[PDB]
């Protein structure tokens, strides 16, 4: 579409901007996939975590 052409003209008339764009995309996508996998991991198996044992503080 025209959005692809707009993005092309905005970002790629130089090269250092391209390098910065790649680095930023990497260090955003990393965080996004981390959040997604952590959330799915939490959802899959509820009740088994370390903060879910009912007797965690009764050996004083």
């Amino acid at each position: 579409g025209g959005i692809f052409e707009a993005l092309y003209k905005v970002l790629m008339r130089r090269n250092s901007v391209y390098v910065t764009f790649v680095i930023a995309g990497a260090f955003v996508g990393e965080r996004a996939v981390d959040y997604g996998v952590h959330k799915l991991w939490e959802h899959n198996n509820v009740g088994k975590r370390y903060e879910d044992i009912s007797v965690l503080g009764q050996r004083q």
């Binding site: 130089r14 250092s16 901007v17 390098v19 910065t20 260090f27 965080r31």
Partner: peptide
């Protein structure tokens, strides 16, 4: 010299951004 100076400015900016990210690596920035 001006296009070359600003090209060097942009390259220095890329390098400085990467080095700053090396110094502090904030997960949720």
């Amino acid at each position: 010299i001006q296009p070359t100076d600003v090209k060097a400015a942009a390259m220095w900016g890329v390098a400085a951004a990467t080095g700053g990210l090396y110094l502090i690596q904030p997960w949720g920035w």
